[PDB]
């Protein structure tokens, strides 16, 4: 049997749970029987990337109905759906092909879950849970719910829920602590830099191998660049439930996971509008979009060194902004160091 807590051995069966990864595909309209999870290539998906591409400068640029047509019938060949009775929704639209994009980031994480769940299952000493834990490779903690650390973001948490995302309460089940293998290494350039913060990421439970294993990385070149409002690279959030939303919860499954990341934000880009950045200004080391409530300055707090703005929502005084709240963007994977994985729980 495994030596690891009972927190984490929880949290990595959550990880590579099989069910998820179905029920994923299943929400994004995919026929898992023309297309079961141990169908998934990483090479088949690459290509959907390339039609959907395809498809939206099409759209952009006013090609024919049939070019459309024609690249609709591709995308769904290829990767087989099921709309039940409905006729199927031809690609003919940005938001739905953004939809697409989207459901593409996620195949591929769930790619990478199942072929590593499926992998190097070879030693038959260890408990299965300890290597699937180690395909992480990630140090994992349980952090004590009585310390100064959990006390600190338990309040982030508490103090940063937004007022319209009312739609639920969160209560922190469990705090990790987490360093993914060569992680710091890779920041520690990062460290001479000013303006360091903690800040969240939500993702789906089913992405969290990819990201553990992987780290948090920025769109490829393949992909559309049209729905990105600041262009692509990460994206973090000060109010905790402007990234809770993208955990993808609900009533029916009330448990998800959210990252904060130490996030090397030097000076910040400023802005208020859409704008698709591919280089930053001159001496800027990130993107910030302005947002008409963030957390009161007065309250921010240092977790050890890093800036932690948890202090209750307030209004800005920025109203010429689109954004209800803030977002932060770096372009550089290796100005990210993640710190803490939270389990959540959301009371609808
Ligand atoms: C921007 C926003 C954000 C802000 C702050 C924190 C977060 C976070 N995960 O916490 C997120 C987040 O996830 N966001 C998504 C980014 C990807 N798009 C899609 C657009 C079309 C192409 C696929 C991507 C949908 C919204």
Redesign the pocket.
Known sequence: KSKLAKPIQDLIKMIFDVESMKKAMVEFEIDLQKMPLGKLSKRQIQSAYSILNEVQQAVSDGGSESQILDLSNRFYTLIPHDFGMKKPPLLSNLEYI??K??ML?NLLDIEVAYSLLRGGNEDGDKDPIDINYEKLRTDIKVVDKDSEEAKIIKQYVKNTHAATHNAYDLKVVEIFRIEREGESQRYKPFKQLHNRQLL????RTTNFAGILSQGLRI?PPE??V????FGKGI???DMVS??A??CHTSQADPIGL?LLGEVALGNMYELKNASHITKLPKGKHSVKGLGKTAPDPTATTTLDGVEVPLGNGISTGINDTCLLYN??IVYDVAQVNLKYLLKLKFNY
């Open positions: 953004q939809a994009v989207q980031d969240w990421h939500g993702s769109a992909a559309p049209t729905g990105y409002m994206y973090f959030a402007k990234s939303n993208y959210i977002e932060y």
